[PDB]
N, CA, C and O atoms as a DFTB+ gen file, in Angstrom:
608 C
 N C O
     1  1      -4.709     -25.710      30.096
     2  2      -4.262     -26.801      29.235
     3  2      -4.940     -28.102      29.630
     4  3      -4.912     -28.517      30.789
     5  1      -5.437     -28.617      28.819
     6  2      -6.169     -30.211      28.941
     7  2      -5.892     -31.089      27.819
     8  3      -5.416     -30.701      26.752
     9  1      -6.176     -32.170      28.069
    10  2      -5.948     -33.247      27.015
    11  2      -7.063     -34.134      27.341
    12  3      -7.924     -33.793      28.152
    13  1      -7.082     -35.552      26.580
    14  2      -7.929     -36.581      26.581
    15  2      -7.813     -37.305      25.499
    16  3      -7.328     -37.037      24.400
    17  1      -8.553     -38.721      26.122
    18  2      -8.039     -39.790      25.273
    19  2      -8.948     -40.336      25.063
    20  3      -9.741     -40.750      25.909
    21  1      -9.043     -40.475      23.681
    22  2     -10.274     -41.109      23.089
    23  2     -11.596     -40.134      23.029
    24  3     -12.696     -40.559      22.675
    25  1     -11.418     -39.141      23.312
    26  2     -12.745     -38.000      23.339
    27  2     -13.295     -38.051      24.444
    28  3     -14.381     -37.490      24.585
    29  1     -12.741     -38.679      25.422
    30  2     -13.196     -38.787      26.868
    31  2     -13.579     -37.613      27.346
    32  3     -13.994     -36.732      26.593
    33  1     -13.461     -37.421      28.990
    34  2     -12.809     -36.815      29.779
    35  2     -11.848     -35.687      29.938
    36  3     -10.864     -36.280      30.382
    37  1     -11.506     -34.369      29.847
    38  2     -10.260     -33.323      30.232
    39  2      -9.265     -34.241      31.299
    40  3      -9.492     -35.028      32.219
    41  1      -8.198     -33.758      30.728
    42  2      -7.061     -34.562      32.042
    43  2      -6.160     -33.050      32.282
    44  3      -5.827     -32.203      31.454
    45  1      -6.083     -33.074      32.781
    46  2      -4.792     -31.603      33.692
    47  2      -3.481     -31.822      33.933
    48  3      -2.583     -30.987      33.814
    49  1      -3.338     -33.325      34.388
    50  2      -2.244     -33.246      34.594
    51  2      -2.309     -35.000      35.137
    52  3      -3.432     -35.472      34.962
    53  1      -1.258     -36.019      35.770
    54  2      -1.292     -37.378      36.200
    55  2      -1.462     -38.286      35.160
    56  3      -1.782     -38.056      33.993
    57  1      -1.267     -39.117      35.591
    58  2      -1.013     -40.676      35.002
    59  2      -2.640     -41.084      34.216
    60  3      -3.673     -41.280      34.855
    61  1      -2.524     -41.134      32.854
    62  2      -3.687     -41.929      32.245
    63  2      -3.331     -43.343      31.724
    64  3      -2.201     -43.827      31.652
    65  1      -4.700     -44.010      31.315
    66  2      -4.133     -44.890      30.695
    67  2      -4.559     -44.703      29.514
    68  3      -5.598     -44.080      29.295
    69  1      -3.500     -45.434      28.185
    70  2      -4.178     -44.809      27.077
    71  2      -4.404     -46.770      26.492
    72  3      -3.629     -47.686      26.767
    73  1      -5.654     -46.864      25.692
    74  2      -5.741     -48.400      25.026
    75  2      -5.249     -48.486      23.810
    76  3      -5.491     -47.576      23.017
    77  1      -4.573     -49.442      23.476
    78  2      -4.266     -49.316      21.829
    79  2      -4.395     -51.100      20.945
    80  3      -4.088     -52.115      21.569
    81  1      -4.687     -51.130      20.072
    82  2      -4.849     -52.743      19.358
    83  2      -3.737     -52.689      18.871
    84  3      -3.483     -51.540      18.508
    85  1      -2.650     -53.650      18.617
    86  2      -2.051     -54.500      17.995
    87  2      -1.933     -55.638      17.563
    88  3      -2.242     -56.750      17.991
    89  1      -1.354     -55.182      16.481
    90  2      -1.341     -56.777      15.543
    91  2      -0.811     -57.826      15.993
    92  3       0.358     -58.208      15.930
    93  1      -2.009     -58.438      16.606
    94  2      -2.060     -59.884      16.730
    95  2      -1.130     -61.168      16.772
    96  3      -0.771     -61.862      17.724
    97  1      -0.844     -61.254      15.320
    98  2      -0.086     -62.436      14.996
    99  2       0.747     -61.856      14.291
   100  3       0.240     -61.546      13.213
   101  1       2.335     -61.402      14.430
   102  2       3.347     -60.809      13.592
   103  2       4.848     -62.185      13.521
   104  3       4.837     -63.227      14.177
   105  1       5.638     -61.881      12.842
   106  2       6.677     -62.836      12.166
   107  2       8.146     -62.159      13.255
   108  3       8.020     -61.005      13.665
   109  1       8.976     -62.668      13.501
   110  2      10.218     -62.530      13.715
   111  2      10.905     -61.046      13.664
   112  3      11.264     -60.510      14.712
   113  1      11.074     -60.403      12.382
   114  2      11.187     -59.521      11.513
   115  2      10.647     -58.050      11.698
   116  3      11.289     -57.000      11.696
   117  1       9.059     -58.295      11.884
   118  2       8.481     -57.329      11.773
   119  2       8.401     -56.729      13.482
   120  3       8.595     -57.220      14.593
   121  1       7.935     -55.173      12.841
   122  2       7.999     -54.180      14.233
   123  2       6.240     -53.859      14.234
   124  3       5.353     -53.987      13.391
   125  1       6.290     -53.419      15.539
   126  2       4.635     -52.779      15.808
   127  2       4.521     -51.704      16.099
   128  3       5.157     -51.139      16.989
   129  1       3.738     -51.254      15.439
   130  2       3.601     -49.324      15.242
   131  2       2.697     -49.112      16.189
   132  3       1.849     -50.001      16.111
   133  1       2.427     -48.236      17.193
   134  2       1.601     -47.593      17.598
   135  2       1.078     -46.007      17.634
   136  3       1.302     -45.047      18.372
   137  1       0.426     -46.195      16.684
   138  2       0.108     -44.687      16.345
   139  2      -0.836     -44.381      17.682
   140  3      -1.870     -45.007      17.913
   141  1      -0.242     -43.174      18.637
   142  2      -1.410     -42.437      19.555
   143  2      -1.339     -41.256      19.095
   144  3      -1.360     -40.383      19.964
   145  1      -1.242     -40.825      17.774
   146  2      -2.389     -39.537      17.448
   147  2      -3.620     -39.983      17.214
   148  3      -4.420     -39.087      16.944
   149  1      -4.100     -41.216      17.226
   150  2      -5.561     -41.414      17.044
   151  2      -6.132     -41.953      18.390
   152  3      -7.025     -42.759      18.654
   153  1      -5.215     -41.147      19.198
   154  2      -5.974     -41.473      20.700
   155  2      -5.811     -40.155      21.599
   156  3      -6.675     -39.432      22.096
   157  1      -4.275     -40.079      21.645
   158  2      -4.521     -38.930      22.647
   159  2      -4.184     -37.293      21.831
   160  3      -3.276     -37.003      21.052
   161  1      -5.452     -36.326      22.449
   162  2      -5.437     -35.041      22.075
   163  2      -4.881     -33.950      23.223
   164  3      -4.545     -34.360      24.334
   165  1      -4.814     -32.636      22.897
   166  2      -4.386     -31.695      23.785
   167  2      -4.906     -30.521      23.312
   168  3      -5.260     -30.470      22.134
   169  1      -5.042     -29.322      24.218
   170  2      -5.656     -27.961      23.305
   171  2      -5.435     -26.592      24.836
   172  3      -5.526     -26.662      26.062
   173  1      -5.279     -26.041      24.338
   174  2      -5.234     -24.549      24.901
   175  2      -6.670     -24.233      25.292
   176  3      -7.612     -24.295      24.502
   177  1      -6.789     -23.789      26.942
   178  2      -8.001     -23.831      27.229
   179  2      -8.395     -22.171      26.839
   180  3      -9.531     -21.701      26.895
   181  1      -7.644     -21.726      26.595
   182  2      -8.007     -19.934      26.683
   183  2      -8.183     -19.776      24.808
   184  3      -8.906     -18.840      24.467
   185  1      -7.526     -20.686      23.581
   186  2      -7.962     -19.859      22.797
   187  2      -6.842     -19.032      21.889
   188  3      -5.831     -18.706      22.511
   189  1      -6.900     -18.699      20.646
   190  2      -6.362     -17.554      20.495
   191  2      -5.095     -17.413      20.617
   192  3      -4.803     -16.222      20.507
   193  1      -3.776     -18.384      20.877
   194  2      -3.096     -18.414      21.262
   195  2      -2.525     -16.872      22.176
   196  3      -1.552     -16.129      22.046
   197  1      -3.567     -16.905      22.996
   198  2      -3.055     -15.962      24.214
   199  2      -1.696     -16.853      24.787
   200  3      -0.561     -16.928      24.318
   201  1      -2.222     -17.406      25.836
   202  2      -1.372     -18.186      26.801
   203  2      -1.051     -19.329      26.424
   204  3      -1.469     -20.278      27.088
   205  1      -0.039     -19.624      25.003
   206  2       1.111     -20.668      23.999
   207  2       1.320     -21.536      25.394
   208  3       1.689     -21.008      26.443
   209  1       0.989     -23.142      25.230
   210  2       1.782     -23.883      25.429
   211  2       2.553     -25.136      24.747
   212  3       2.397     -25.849      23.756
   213  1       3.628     -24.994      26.003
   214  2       5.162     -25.681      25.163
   215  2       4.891     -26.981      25.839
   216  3       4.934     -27.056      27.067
   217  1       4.557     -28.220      24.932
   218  2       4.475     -29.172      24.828
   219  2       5.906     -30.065      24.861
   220  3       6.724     -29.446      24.179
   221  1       6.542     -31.379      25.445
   222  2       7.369     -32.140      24.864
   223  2       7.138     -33.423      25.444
   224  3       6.086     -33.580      26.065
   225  1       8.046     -34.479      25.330
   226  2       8.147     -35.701      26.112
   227  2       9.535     -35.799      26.316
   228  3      10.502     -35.507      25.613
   229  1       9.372     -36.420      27.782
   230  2      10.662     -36.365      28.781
   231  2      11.679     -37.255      28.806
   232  3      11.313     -38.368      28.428
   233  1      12.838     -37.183      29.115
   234  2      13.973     -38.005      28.777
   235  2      13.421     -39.177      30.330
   236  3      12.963     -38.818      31.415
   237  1      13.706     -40.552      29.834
   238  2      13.442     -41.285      30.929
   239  2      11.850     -42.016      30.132
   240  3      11.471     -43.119      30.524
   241  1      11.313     -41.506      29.392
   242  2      10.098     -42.415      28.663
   243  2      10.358     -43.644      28.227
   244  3      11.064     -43.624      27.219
   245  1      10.047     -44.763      28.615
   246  2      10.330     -46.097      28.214
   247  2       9.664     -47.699      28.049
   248  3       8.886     -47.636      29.002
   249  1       9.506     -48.742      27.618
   250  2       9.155     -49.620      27.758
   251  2       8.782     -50.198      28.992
   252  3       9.613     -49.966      29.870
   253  1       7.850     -50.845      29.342
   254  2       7.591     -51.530      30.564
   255  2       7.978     -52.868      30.693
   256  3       8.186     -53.612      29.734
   257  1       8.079     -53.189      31.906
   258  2       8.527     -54.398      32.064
   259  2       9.166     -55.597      31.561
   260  3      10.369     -55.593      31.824
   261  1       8.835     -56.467      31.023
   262  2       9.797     -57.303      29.699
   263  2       9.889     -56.957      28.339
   264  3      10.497     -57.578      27.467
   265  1       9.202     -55.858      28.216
   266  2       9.310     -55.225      26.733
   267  2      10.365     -54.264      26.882
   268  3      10.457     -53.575      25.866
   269  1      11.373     -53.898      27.966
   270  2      12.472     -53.312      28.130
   271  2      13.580     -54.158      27.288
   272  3      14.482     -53.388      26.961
   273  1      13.809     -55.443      26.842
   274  2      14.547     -55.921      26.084
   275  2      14.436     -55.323      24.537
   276  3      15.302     -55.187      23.673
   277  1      12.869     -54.991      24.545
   278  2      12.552     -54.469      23.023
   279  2      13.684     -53.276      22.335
   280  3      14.688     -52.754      22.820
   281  1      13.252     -53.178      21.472
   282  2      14.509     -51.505      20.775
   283  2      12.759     -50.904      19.975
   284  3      11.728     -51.451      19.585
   285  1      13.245     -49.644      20.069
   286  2      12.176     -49.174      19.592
   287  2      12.772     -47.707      19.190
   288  3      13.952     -47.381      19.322
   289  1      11.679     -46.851      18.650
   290  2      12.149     -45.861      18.587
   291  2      10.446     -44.637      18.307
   292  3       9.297     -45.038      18.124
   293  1      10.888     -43.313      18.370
   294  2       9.514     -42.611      18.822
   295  2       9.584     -41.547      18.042
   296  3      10.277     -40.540      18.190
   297  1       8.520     -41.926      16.853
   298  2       8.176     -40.373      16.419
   299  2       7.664     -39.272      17.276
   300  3       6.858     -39.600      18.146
   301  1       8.028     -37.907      17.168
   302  2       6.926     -36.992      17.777
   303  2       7.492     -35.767      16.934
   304  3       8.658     -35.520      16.625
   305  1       6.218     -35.012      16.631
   306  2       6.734     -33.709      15.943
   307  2       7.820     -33.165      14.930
   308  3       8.304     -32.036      15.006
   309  1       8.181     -34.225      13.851
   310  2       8.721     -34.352      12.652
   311  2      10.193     -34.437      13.206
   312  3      11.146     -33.834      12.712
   313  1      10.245     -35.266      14.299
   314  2      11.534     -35.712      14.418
   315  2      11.458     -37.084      15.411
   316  3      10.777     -37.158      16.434
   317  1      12.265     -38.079      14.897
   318  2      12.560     -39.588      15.419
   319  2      13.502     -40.063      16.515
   320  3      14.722     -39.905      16.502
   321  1      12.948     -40.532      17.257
   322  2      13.783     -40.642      18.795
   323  2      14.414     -42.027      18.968
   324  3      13.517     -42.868      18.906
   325  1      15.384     -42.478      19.124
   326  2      15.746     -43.783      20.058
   327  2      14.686     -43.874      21.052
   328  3      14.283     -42.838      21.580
   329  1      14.103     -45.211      21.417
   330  2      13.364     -45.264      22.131
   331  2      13.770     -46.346      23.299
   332  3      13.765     -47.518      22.924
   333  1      14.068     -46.136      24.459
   334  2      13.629     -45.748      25.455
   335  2      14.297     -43.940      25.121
   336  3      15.442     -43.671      24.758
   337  1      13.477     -43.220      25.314
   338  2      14.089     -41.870      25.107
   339  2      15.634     -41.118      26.005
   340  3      15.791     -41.111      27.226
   341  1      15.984     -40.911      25.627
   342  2      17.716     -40.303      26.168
   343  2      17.540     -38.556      26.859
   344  3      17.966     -37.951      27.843
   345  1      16.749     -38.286      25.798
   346  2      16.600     -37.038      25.882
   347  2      15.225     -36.673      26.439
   348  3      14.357     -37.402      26.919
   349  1      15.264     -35.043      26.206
   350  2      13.337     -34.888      26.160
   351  2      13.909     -34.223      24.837
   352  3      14.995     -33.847      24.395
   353  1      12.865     -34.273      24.534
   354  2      12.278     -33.852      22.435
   355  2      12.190     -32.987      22.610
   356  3      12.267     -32.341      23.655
   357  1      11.906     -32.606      21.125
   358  2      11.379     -31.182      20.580
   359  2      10.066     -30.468      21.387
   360  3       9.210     -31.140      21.962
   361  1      10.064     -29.316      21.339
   362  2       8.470     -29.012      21.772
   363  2       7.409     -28.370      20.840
   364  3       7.718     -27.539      19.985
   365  1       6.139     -28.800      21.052
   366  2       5.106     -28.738      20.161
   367  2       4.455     -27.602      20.804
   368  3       4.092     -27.572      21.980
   369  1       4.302     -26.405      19.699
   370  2       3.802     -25.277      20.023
   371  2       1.902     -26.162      20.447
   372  3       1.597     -27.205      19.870
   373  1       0.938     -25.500      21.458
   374  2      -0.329     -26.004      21.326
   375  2      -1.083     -24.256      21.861
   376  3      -0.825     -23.565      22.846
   377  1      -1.852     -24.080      20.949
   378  2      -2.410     -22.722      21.351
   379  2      -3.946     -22.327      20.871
   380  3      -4.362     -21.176      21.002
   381  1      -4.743     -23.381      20.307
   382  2      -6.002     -23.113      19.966
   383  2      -7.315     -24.312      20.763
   384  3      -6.986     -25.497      20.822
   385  1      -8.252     -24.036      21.134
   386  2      -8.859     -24.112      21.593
   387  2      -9.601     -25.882      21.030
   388  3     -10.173     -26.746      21.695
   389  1      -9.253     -25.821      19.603
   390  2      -9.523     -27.110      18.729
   391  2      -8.239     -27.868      19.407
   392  3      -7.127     -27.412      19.672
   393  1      -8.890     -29.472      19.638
   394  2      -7.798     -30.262      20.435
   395  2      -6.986     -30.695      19.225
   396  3      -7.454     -30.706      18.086
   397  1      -5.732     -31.055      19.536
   398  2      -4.763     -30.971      18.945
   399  2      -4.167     -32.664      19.157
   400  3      -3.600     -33.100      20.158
   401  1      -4.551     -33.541      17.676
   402  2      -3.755     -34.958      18.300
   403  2      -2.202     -35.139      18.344
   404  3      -1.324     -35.074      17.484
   405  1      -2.209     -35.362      19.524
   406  2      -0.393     -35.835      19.336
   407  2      -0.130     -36.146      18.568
   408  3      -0.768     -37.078      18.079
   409  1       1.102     -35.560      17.822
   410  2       2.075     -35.848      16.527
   411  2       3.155     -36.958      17.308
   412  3       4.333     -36.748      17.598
   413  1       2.283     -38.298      17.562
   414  2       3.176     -39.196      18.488
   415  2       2.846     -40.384      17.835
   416  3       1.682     -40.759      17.695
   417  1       4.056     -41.138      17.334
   418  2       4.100     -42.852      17.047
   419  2       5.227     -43.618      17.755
   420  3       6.258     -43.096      18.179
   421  1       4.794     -45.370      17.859
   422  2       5.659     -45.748      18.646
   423  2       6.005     -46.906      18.017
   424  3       5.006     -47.458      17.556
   425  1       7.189     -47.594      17.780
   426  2       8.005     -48.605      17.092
   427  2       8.383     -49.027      17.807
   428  3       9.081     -48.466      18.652
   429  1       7.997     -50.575      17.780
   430  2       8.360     -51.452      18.467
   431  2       8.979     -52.799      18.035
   432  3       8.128     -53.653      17.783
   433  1      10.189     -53.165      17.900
   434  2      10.641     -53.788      17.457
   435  2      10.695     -55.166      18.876
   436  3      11.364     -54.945      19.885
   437  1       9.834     -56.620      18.695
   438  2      10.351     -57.584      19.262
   439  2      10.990     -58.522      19.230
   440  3      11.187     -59.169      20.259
   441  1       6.045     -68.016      22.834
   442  2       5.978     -67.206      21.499
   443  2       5.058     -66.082      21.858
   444  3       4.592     -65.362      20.975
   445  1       4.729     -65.877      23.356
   446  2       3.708     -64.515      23.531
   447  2       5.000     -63.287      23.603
   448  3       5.968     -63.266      24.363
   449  1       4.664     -62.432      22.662
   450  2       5.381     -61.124      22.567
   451  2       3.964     -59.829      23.777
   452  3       4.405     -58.910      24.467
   453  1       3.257     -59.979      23.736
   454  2       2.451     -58.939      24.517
   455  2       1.193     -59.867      24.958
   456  3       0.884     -60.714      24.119
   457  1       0.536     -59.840      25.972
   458  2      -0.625     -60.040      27.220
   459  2      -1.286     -58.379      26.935
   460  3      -0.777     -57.258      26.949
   461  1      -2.917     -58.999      26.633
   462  2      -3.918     -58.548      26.977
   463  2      -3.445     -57.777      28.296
   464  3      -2.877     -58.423      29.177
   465  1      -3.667     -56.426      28.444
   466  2      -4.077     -55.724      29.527
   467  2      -2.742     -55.193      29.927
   468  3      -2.907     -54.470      30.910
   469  1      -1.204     -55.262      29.497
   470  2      -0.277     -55.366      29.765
   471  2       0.167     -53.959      29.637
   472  3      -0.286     -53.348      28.669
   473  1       0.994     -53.316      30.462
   474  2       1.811     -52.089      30.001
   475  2       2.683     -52.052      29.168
   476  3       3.583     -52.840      29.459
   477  1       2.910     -51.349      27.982
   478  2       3.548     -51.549      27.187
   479  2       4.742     -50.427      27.411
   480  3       5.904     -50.724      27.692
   481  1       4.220     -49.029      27.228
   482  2       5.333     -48.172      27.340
   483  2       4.455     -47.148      28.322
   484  3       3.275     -47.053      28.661
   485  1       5.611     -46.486      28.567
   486  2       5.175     -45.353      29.823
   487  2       5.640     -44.079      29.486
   488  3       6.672     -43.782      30.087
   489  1       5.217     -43.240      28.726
   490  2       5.672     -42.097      28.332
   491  2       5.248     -40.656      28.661
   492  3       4.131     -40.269      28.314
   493  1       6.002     -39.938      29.243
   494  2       5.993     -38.884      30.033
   495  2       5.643     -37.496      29.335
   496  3       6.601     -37.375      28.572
   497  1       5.062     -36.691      29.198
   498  2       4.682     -35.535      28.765
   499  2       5.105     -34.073      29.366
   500  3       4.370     -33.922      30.341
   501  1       5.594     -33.409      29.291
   502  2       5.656     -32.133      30.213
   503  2       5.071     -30.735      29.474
   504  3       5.502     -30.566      28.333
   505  1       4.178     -29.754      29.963
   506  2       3.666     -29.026      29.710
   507  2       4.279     -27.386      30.287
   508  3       4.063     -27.183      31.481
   509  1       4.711     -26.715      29.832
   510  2       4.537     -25.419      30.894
   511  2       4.339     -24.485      29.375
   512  3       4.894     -24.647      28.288
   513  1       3.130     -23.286      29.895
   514  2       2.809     -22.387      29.383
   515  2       4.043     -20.674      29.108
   516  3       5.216     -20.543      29.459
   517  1       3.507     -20.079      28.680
   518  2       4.697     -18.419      27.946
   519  2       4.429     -18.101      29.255
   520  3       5.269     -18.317      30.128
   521  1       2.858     -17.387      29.609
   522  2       2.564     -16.469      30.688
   523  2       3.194     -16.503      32.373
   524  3       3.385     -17.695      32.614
   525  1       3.516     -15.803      33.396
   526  2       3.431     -15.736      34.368
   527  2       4.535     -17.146      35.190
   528  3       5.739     -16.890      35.212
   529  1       4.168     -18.276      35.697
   530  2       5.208     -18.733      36.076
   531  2       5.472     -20.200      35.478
   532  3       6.367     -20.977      35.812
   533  1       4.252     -20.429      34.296
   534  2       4.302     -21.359      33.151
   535  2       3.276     -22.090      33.567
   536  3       2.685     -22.667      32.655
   537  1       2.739     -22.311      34.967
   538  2       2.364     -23.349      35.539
   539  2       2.565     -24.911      34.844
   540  3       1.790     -25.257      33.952
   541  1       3.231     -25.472      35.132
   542  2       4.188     -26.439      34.757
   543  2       3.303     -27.505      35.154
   544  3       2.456     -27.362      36.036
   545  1       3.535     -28.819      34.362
   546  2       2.759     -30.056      34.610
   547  2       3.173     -30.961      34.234
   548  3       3.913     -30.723      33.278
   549  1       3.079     -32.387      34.569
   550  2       3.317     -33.406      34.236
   551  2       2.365     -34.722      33.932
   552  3       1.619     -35.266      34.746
   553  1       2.558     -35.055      32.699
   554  2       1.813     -36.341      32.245
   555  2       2.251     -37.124      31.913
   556  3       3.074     -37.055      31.000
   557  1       1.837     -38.493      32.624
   558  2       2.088     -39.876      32.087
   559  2       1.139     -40.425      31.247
   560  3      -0.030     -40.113      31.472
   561  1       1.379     -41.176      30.323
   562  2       0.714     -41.860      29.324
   563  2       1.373     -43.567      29.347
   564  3       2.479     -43.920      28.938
   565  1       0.127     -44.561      30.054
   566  2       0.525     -45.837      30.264
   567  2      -0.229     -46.227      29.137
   568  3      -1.414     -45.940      28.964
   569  1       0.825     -47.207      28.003
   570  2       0.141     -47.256      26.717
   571  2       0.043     -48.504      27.082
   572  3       0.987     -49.166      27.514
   573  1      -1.683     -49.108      26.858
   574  2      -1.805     -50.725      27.294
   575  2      -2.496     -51.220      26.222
   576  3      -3.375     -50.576      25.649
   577  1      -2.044     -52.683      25.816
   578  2      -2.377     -53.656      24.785
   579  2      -3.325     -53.661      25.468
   580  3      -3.286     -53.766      26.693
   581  1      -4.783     -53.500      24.492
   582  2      -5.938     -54.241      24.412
   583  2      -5.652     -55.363      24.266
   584  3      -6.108     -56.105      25.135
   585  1      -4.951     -55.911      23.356
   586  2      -5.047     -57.724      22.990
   587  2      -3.468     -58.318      23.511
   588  3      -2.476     -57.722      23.930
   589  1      -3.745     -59.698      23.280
   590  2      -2.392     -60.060      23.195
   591  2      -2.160     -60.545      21.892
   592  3      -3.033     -60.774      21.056
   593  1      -0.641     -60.727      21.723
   594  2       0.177     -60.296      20.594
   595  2       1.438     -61.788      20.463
   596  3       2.372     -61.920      21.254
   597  1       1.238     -62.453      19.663
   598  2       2.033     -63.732      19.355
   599  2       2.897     -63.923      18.320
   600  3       2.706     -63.282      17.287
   601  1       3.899     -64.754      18.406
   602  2       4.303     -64.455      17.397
   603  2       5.098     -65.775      17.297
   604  3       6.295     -65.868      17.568
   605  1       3.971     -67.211      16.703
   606  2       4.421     -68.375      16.445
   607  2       5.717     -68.994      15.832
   608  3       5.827     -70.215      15.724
């Protein structure tokens, strides 16, 4: 099982960082979406769905630092989460060899609202496979503002 972000690199398992743009200059009112299916992928290294893995994200996934006041909430896999997550989610079958983008969005409901370079959310991944003893894994995904984000 591997993943990667942005067409990078294979990752196995540990802490990445993933980059994302947001809108800039937003109003009172409005929320900020972060779509990372157009960043991070995943895929079955064998193929064929021999050796199915069970994909989810972990209860304990949450906002960073002063964006912990935020409310948000987390698509993944045709179902919508309270966000900081309570639970761990659904799991996403992954079994072909073609990488597979996360079925993952992030709502963020918040005069600087976000800093350039800043952690935004920290969201946890867990992997274990059908075969033998699953070999089990864990991924973090540190989602960081490219820009900063105001909101006059």
């Amino acid at each position: 099982f591997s993943c990667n972000v942005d067409g990078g690199s294979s990752i196995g398992a540990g802490t990445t960082s993933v980059y994302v743009n947001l809108d800039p200059v937003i109003q009172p009112g409005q929320n900020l979406v972060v779509d990372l299916s157009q960043h991070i992928s995943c895929w079955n290294d064998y193929g064929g769905w021999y050796d199915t893995d069970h994909i989810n994200l972990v209860q304990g996934s949450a906002f960073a630092g002063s964006l912990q006041s935020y409310k948000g909430s987390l698509y993944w896999n045709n179902v919508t989460y309270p966000f900081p997550l309570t639970t761990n989610t659904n799991v996403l079958d992954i079994g072909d060899k073609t990488p597979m983008p996360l079925p993952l969005k992030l709502y963020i409901t918040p005069g600087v609202v976000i800093k350039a370079g800043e952690v935004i959310a920290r969201i946890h991944m867990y992997k274990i496979a059908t075969l033998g003893s699953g070999n089990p894994r864990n991924f973090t995904w540190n989602i960081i503002s490219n820009n900063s984000v105001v909101m006059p």
